[PDB]
Amino acid sequence: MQNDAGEFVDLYVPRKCSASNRIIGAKDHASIQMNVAEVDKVTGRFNGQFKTYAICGAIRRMGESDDSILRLAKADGIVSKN
Amino acid sequence: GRVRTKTVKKAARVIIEKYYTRLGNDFHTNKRVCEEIAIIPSKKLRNKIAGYVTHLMKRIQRGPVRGISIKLQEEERERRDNYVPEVSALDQEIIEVDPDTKEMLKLLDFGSLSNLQVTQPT
Amino acid sequence: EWMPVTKLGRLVKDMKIKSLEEIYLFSLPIKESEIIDFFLGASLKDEVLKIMPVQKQTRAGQRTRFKAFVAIGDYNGHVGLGVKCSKEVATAIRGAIILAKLSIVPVRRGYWGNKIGKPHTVPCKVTGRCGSVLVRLIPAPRGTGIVSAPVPKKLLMMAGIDDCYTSARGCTATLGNFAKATFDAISKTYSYLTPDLWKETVFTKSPYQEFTDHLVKT
Amino acid sequence: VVADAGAFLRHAALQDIGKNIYTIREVVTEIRDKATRRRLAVLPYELRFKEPLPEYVRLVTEFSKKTGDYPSLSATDIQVLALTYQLEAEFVGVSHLKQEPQKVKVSSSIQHPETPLHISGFHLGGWITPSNIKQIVGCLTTDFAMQNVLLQMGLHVLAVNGMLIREARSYILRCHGCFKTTSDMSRVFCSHCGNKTLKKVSVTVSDDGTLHMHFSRNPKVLNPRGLRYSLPTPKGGKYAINPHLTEDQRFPQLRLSQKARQKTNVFAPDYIAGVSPFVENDISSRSATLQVRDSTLGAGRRRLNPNASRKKFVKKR
Amino acid sequence: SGALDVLQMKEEDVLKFLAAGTHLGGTNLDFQMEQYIYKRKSDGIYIINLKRTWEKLLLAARAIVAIENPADVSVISSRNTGQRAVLKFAAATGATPIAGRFTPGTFTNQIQAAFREPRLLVVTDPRADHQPLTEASYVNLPTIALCNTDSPLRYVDIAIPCNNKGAHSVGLMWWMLAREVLRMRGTISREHPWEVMPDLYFYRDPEEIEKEEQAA
Amino acid sequence: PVNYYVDTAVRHVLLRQGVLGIKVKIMLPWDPTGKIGPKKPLPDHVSIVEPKDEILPTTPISEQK
RNA sequence: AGAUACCGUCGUAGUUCCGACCAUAAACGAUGCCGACCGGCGAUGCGGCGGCGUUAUUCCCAUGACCCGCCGGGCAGCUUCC
Ligand SMILES: [Zn+2]
């Protein structure tokens, strides 16, 4: 990552999965980047803001990326409790 | 027998797509407008093309066939797609509901709905 | 003059995708070989690893066609591998050259001992598999060179890997298996979480979600 | 005396006593049987062609959903009942009609739905005694969806049986899920909720329209047992077979070969010359190699629950 | 749901799901769907927790919003129950629909004239149109599937527990999906109920055309 | 159209061991002869005039010159 | 064409019981034993736990017989890009 002098010796920083923290590989095509939008707490229109999520493919293979995104938006208050 | 060909079929459908408005139900007027637009070879080919155009006009005047994509018929279709009746079937008085469905909305704080009907459980 | 057929290629062509790296960051597939020619260009070399003749068992005998194992590589950055089977031997080669450009992984380079200067070896001891072919890359001190079979030495050279310790197992004589497996293993260097990579990833705007104003234009 | 396509399908040539015979032009052109067109060639000169009015049609459709038969009727089946409405407003006293008649009055029994309620050779005597096959103003309709709407108005009609109607014994299908009765006996999936939660419901309709319906209170039908099982991956291709969930998901075209799909018409005496005394079995085509079977064949294995003890060497479709 | 009373399931809308019978679930229930259920009852009709169903609509009613070009959404029915909804969905949306047959290779085969590159997929059925799901597994497409109780969540991204075996059951889901995303974007707001009646998005069933032309 | 599109040429080249004989066929294109191809197009090809865009009037305005 | 073989009629030893030998089998899941972890789904066998109901002539509790669910150990399935 960083050499002795401290320059960033790497090409790009690969993004990590937002569910299981694994590296999304560069040739991974079941991968997701779901830009979920934010609401007003009052009006219900579009904020201008949006929360980007990320699902790796092996999670998406298992049918479990539904609950994963579901509890990630629980974690960001986009899903109400119960 | 006498089976048409892709050169007959796939090229006639393009005349439908672009110039449906000038077409009609004649063989002999579809054929005279065919040479106005289709830069064709020999006349047997344009006769088979014009015959498939005429047969296809006959097929259209029942209803839309699969092969077409018409700028005029689809706006006609959307103005026949918009069948908006008086009473939609989601504005009704009595809808019979199982007792196990009833306990959900009492817990999901919508037990105040009066349009329901708990029936005799079978 | 190249006219792309994807939303990817237009943003590549029209100065909107800045580097090759942003395609790797959002893991977008590349379906147009000219994008590879756009960024790499001159800094890209290719090698025929084998031409083998194959025969289709036709009802009237056999007929001859040729496979072509072409590995390409940006020296210091990237590799690829393509396998085209055609009838004409010049056709099978130029098919696999395009087919290898469609298969460009990047590679991560690390250090053996202390991190002085530029990286030279594999960051950890990664492995790869392709059909009973185990291939293991191992980090190596600076200047030891590639200690391998002649075949993965091509891919490791064309990556920019200066030096490595290779160990392999299986029926390595079957070239396609043995060349994909070492292509597998160098593909996994960026697919390996090391403690450098614990910084939480700020998801930047994807160029689809960013430059879609220019995609409504064309 | 309104004539129907079922009266000519059973060939009820009864233009002799009822003499006010009116009919629809469409319901005789839609018949695909040639012996009915043979009936159309000679006899129907005594009847008259007529259509009902759009004021009359909509008022028929009002209590049609209130008797729960409007999707069960065909489109041509709507106009025939409205064709009776102008005749009744013309000839008969309108003052003896009713509409929105009556409730369900569930007569819950311990009788299984599949019991032979009045199937002729079945007996619990009742023989056949070979005369009785022909012993098995108004209308002549053999469709119960037609017959249901008539008697709820209080409209006595007749049939190929020259006497009037008083008893209407048939079966309908109520959705066990959404409580929706259809008069169709052919479909197996629901029309409102689309599940396989249709169950057999026997009715009994009088001439006045006393709807009383034997809902079979028996937990062999009210059963959740063979109802949960894991399903394979959804398969897409020319030869995929998805396990028939909805009434209309696009199955691929799988068809029998016409040299296999046809049986023997062994009744016909033009029969002697040539082949074996049975139909030749199809061992050649790729209809046989893909093991394409009839949708009606093997239906008893559908009724078997999935999680059971199948013998260790079977494989179905 | 984002715990807003602005976004809470309103009192009229509960009636429609009861009316068409979306609360009536299938006979089979996926264990991946067993989170979303309310209860098993007798005779295997797994009644779906509708507030949970309502919470999953709204995440999908946030997912479609962030895309700048609304044409970048593919909306697909493979069967003949969600044809009329999907077509006039995009008429009210600006989406890019696919009705009827999904051409295998619409998302992969870059040579085709049918080849489109969307940014988001919404599916009527994860069993009927499963073919554009596996297509969406290759082009990095997020996914929304109108999931029944028996609906495998494979390659879905968010999923909505409704019923879709019923004709009206499907059409109310698309109508009310479109009802929120438009009021999310900035048309007429939460006060007015929407001018398009959900009977427009019901399936036509052209045996009923001859049952509606002969009376109206 | 094999008789005005392809050009058949047949030779007899010599070597030490015998004779090779080559065959070269050149199927000519369209766009009539600026040394290039024939006048007459393919009798299978059906060129349809591109969809000519026309202005739609709404109000009866009589443009009298 | 060839048969001492594919056939039939009899039929010893054996197949049967008891007492000793004998220790091999395509003795098979062609898959050592014990323990842990790793997806689902119902059916079934045994034991137990709980429960609206129906029948043993109801009923009084019994107790069986079914029916819905749960636990544990079994023989088995089916499913699935673990
Ligand atoms: Zn139903």
Numbering used by the authors:
A (entry chain V): 1 to 82
B (entry chain R): 2 to 123
C (entry chain C): 59 to 276
D (entry chain y): 7 to 130, 206 to 217, 232 to 412
E (entry chain A): 2 to 217
F (entry chain D): 163 to 227
Paper text:
Hence, the final maturation step releasing functional 40S ribosomal subunits, namely processing of the 18S ribosomal RNA 3′ end, is safeguarded by the protein DIM2, which both interacts with the endoribonuclease NOB1 and masks the rRNA cleavage site. We conclude that states A and B of the pre-40S particles here isolated with RIO1(kd)-StHA correspond to two very late maturation stages, just before and right after cleavage of the 18S rRNA 3′ end.
In the pre-cleavage state, DIM2 and NOB1 are still in place, while the postion of RIO1 is not clearly defined and RPS26 is absent. State A harbored an rRNA scaffold closely resembling that of the mature 18S rRNA. On the head region, the three-way junction formed by rRNA helices h34, h35, and h38 is fully formed, while RPS3, RPS10, and RPS12 occupy their final position. Like in many other pre-40S structures, the upper part of rRNA h44, located on the intersubunit side, appears detached from the body. Low-pass filtering of the cryo-EM map of state A also revealed the presence of TSR1 in this region. On the platform region, the cryo-EM density map allowed to unambiguously position nucleotide A1870, belonging to the ITS1 after the 3′ end of the mature 18S rRNA. In this state, DIM2 protects this region of the 18S-E pre-rRNA and impedes endonucleolytic cleavage by NOB1, located right next to DIM2. Furthermore, NOB1 and DIM2 are the only two RBFs that can clearly be distinguished, while RIO1(kd)-StHA, the protein used as purification bait, cannot be clearly positioned on this cryo-EM map. The absence of a clear density for RIO1 in pre-cleavage state A suggests that RIO1 is initially flexibly associated, while DIM2 and NOB1 are stably bound.
